[PDB]
Amino acid sequence: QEQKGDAPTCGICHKTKFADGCGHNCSYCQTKFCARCGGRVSLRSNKVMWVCNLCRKQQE
């Protein structure tokens, strides 16, 4: 991680730029993806985890 004024980008379409900070990161691959290249999977009200369509699908 290096703060060089680099904006947030999707690791799939590389188009959708995350908001001020960080977008959705795969709870597995850890890859940064947009709300369209992943899904919301919270493990009980305490922590919200996002899994890419490749993990959410392959992992059923």
Reported in sequence order, the residue ranges of the chain that DSSP labels E, i.e. its strands, are 24-25, 32-33, 38-42, 48-52
Residue selected from 8, 12, 18, 49 as contacting Zn ion according to rule CB under 5 A: 12
Q: 22 among the known binding-site residues?
A: no
Residues 21-60 within binding reach of Zn ion (CB under 5 A): 26, 28-29, 33-34, 37, 52, 55
38 contacts 29 by C-beta, under 8 angstroms: no
Q: Which residues lie below 8 Å from residue 20, measured CB to CB, with a gap of 6+? A: none
Q: Which residues are annotated as a binding site for Zn(2+)?
A: 10, 13, 26, 29, 34, 37, 52, 55
Q: Which residues are annotated as a binding site?
A: 10, 13, 26, 29, 34, 37, 52, 55
